[PDB]
Design a protein around this ligand. Structure first.
Ligand SMILES: OC[C@@H]1[C@@H](O)[C@H](O)[C@@H](O)c2[nH]cc[n+]21
Length: 489
């Protein structure tokens, strides 16, 4: 047996764009992502799969059924987001005291009069519907983390096709400080409207992926898919100060904890000669971002500066974790290696003989212990594991994947790390971005024709864990690597 603290909660995470649409009247055509996946040129290039989010699992209409299953499953925590585009589908008036030419947004004044003006422009049907969803959620005794942002922006803030084409005259997303200003107002506004229902807040989900895939990893088919080291830095600079202003905005309205959710890889040495390459990978991929929003340390242009407006803007850390990255020391610096981590073949084995998911991701649960303990020792801010899961429609590996990673969180707590819950990605299958519906991460299988939900055997395993607040003796064998012999190589 591995028992968790009495206050620890097992649950799930979900995104609006990925799960909401599918039922009559649920369509949200008004995001950069929606336009991006419907684009004929993007479809012909194979940048996006051709699957359309409006054919998705239908959480907007069917939320009481998702919640029914989560409750059957004994889940006690949920993290999801409000879709910005649903609240403000049309543009807001240009802000006052806003100089679009300044690099830094060090303050965004929001007062109650401003919020009531904001309220005039908000979609009321959507606001009421989200209230109905979150209320039903709370009525199941689910603790509620509200995330403000999980990738799609209102189209009036970002036209990604225009940007893909190299035209920077239109709405340019995280490349514009207007988006930073509006994000702060949006987040404060949502905290003002929902604080009675929320337990903890997150400002954003995985900002590094937004800037990294949007402007460098352009083969991934993430908007705007404009290849530029320089614009990726600008995007990341803007998203950081956006988080800080959102933190201040929410705090102006709420006393509740405000954190952030970030995408993590466990950086692993190829040989015992690559321990320094690991540290460098960790600097370049993790610490630089958290040192910015915790310690105010940031690079602006060429200068390494400290900004007092950034410092201390974090109460907790959402650890998203799927797999490792293997690195090796180089002449220049270091490189990530193909054949490990998320750079493997689908439904195969990594170069280390570890099985890979439907997405080509390597089974590596100890990475989670690595990540959780490293964050803890560096900052001493409590954590939630806000995502962890596997693309596995067959459910071959998920039972092992689940029990193994949950064991690693136990290990982390045992070492003294303050980790307060584990949130599987996800309750049910959903729209996996540029990959479409074929990447199935659900504990529950979705029939996309009928919108019926099915319990994969792993959902039954998760019920055993959640209802007992422990990995029980009877399932402890699943704290192991899925046997590789019977699987594809
Ligand atoms: O790919 C599975 C999931 C996505 O569906 C989520 O939207 C995103 O938060 C994320 N980051 C890493 C892995 N995942």
């Amino acid at each position: 047996m591995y028992s968790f603290p009495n206050s620890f909660r097992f649950g799930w995470s979900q995104a609006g764009f990925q799960s909401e649409m599918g039922t009559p009247g649920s369509e949200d055509p008004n995001t950069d992502w929606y336009k991006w996946v419907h684009d004929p040129e993007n479809m012909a290039a194979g940048l996006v799969s051709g699957d359309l989010p409006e054919n998705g699992p239908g959480y907007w209409g069917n939320y009481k059924t998702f919640h029914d299953n989560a409750q059957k499953m004994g889940l006690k925590i949920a993290r999801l987001n409000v879709e910005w585009s649903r609240i403000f589908p049309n543009p807001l008036p240009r802000p006052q005291n806003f100089d679009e030419s300044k690099q830094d947004v060090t303050e965004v004044e929001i007062n109650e009069n401003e919020l009531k003006r904001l309220d005039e422009y908000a979609n009321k049907d959507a606001l009421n519907h989200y209230r109905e969803i979150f209320k039903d959620l709370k009525s199941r005794g689910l603790y509620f983390i509200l995330n403000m942002y999980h990738w799609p922006l209102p189209l009036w803030l970002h036209d990604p096709i225009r940007v893909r084409r190299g035209d920077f005259t239109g709405p340019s997303g995280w490349l514009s400080t207007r988006t930073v200003y509006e994000f702060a107002r949006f987040s404060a506004y949502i905290a003002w409207k929902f604080d009675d229902l929320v337990d903890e807040y997150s400002t954003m989900n995985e900002p590094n992926v937004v800037g990294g895939l949007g402007y460098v990893g352009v083969k991934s088919g993430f908007p705007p898919g404009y290849l530029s080291f320089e614009l990726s830095r600008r995007a990341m600079y803007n998203i950081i100060q956006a988080h800080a202003r959102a933190y201040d905005g929410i705090k102006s309205v709420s006393k509740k904890p405000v954190g952030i959710i970030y995408a993590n890889s466990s950086f692993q040495p190829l040989t015992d000669k690559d321990m320094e390459a690991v540290e460098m990978a960790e600097n370049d991929n993790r610490w630089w971002f958290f040192d910015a929003i915790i310690r105010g340390e940031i690079t602006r242009g060429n200068e390494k500066i400290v900004r007092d407006d950034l410092k201390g803007r974090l109460d907790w850390i959402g650890v998203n974790y799927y797999t490792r990255t293997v690195v090796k020391r180089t002449e220049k610096g270091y490189v990530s290696l193909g054949g490990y981590g998320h750079g493997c073949e689908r439904n195969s084995v990594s170069l280390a003989g570890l099985p890979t998911s439907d997405f080509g991701w390597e089974f590596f649960p100890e990475g989670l212990y690595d990540v959780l303990t490293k964050y803890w020792n560096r900052y001493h801010l409590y954590m939630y594991v806000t995502e962890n899961g596997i693309a596995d429609d067959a459910d071959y590996q998920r039972p092992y994947y689940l029990v193994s990673h949950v064991y690693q969180v136990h290990r982390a707590i045992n070492s003294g790390a303050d980790v307060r819950g584990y949130l599987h990605w996800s309750l049910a299958d959903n729209y996996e971005w540029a990959s479409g519906f074929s990447m199935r991460f659900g504990l529950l299988k979705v029939d996309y024709n009928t919108k019926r939900l099915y319990w994969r055997p792993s959902a039954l395993v998760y019920r055993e864990i959640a209802t007992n607040g422990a990995i029980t003796d009877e399932i402890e064998h699943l704290n192991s690597v899925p046997p590789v012999k019977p699987l594809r190589h």
